[PDB]
Amino acid sequence: EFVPPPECPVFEPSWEEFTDPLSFIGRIRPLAEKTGICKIRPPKDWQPPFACEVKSFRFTPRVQRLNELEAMTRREYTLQSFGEMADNFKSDYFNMPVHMVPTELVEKEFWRLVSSIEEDVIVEYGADISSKDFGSGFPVKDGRRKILPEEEEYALSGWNLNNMPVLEQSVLAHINKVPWLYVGMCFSSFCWHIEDHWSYSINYLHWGEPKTWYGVPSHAAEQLEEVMRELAPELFESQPDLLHQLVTIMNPNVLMEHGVPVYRTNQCAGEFVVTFPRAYHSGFNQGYNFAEAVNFCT
Numbered sequence: 001e002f003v004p005p006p007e008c009p010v011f012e013p014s015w016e017e018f019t020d021p022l023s024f025i026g027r028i029r030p031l032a033e034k035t036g037i038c039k040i041r042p043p044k045d046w047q048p049p050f051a052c053e054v055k056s057f058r059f060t061p062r063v064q065r066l067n068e069l070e071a072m073t074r075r076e077y078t079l080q081s082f083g084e085m086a087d088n089f090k091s092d093y094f095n096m097p098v099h100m101v102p103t104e105l106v107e108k109e110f111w112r113l114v115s116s117i118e119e120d121v122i123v124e125y126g127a128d129i130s131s132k133d134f135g136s137g138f139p140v141k142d143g144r145r146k147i148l149p150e151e152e153e154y155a156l157s158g159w160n161l162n163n164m165p166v167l168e169q170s171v172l173a174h175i176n177k178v179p180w181l182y183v184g185m186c187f188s189s190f191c192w193h194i195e196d197h198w199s200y201s202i203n204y205l206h207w208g209e210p211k212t213w214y215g216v217p218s219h220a221a222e223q224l225e226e227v228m229r230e231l232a233p234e235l236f237e238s239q240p241d242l243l244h245q246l247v248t249i250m251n252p253n254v255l256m257e258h259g260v261p262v263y264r265t266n267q268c269a270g271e272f273v274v275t276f277p278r279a280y281h282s283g284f285n286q287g288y289n290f291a292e293a294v295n296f297c298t
C-alpha cells in the first residue's frame, strides 16, 4: 500500500567537480536544499579501502521493536557474527537470498510492520559507535594503523569524513567532533529528526546493502513539526524536541497526505548522502551494511 516518495537529486560529479566537497555542496545547494537530502556518487575509480580494525571490532547493538509506538503507547557481536545474524534474519524473513529481495519490497514491508499490531518484529542496530573505538572506516594518518601508498590519497581526501570542517564560528570559540559508525541490518531504522544546531551532515556507506532515506526540505520544517505533534501520541506531545526525536517514527505517506514534501533515495555502497540544515530526515537499512556519518560546518 506504501507509495514511494519521489526520488531526491543524485549527482555524479566529474573529477574536476570532485575536488572540494564544500565547494561542490555550495554549488548544488539551490536544488538540494529544496529537497532536504541529496545523493552524491563519486567517480567510479574513487574507492577508499575499509580501514576499521575488523579483528577487534566488537559491539553490543541496541534493540529496536518496529511497532513499539502502535503497541505500547497507543548479544555482543563481532562484525562477522552480526553479519551472519543479519543475513540469516533477512533470508529467513523473505524466504529468499538476501540480495534477491527487491528494495521496494523491504520498504513496503518495513512500513507495514511499523503500524502492525498483530506481528512483532524485533531487530538490532549497531549505532553510535565512535570512530575512536576501532578506527574510522576511512584511512587516517593517525599512526595507529598502516596506510599503503595507494591508500594515502584517501587519507588526505577532502571527502574523507575525518577531514570535514566541524568547527562553528562563535565568540565563545575565542574566549575558550569525530565521525560515528552505524552497523545496520534489515529493518533497523532511524526516526525523523534534525541535527543539533541545524547542522549539515554527510553520510558514507562503506559497504553492504543499501540504506533507504527520506528527507524533508527545511522550508517545510515547521509544517512537519505541526503534523508530528498532531499525530504523534498525545502522551509525548509536550516533550522537548531533543527527547521527542527519539520516538518520531512516521510513515512518509502520512506526512505527504498532510502536504509535507518528502523525497526518498536508496544509498548504495560507496555513495554519499548529504542532509542540509534543518532538513528532517529518517530511514532504514535494507540489510547488513556499514555507514559513517559526521556533522560539518560551512
Ligand SMILES: C=CS(=O)(=O)N1CCCN(c2cc(NCCC(=O)O)nc(-c3ccccn3)n2)CC1
Residues within 6 Å of the ligand: 125, 127, 128, 182, 189, 190, 191, 192, 193, 194, 195, 196, 203, 211, 245, 246, 247, 291, 292, 293
Ligand atoms: C534521532 C535518531 S534515533 O532516535 O532514531 N536513534 C536510533 C538510530 C541510530 N542513532 C542515530 C542515527 C542518526 N542518523 C542515521 C545514521 C545511520 O543510521 O547511518 N542520527 C542520530 C541523531 C541523534 C541526535 C541528534 C542527531 N542525530 N542518531 C541513535 C538514535
Ligand SMILES: [Mn+2]
Residues within 6 Å of the ligand: 193, 194, 195
Ligand atoms: Mn542524525
